[PDB]
């Protein structure tokens, strides 16, 4: 929170194997604004993603 988020720095990288978005489309993110982002982070088996 209390910051500016350039999602194009994330989305333009091919290093992410998937970037699946479920209530916004990733090209729209830079025109939106949000209250909290809540980044959750963990490791799992690749076939389970």
């Amino acid at each position: 929170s209390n910051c500016v988020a350039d999602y194009s720095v994330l989305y333009n990288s091919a290093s992410f194997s998937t970037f699946k978005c479920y209530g916004v489309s990733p090209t729209k993110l830079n025109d939106l604004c949000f209250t909290n982002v809540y980044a959750d982070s963990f490791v799992i088996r690749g076939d389970e993603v």
């Binding site: 091919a14 489309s25 990733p26 090209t27």
Partner: protein
Amino acid sequence: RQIAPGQTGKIADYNYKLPDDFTGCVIAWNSNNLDSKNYNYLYR
């Protein structure tokens, strides 16, 4: 899997894209023997 209606990816914004309501088929295979050796192939 991006060569389909409404998808996004490395080619989608820069190389090749299908209409949202495309009426057609997509037919594809990993030939590899003729395909791999490469300087013939590129993306934007």
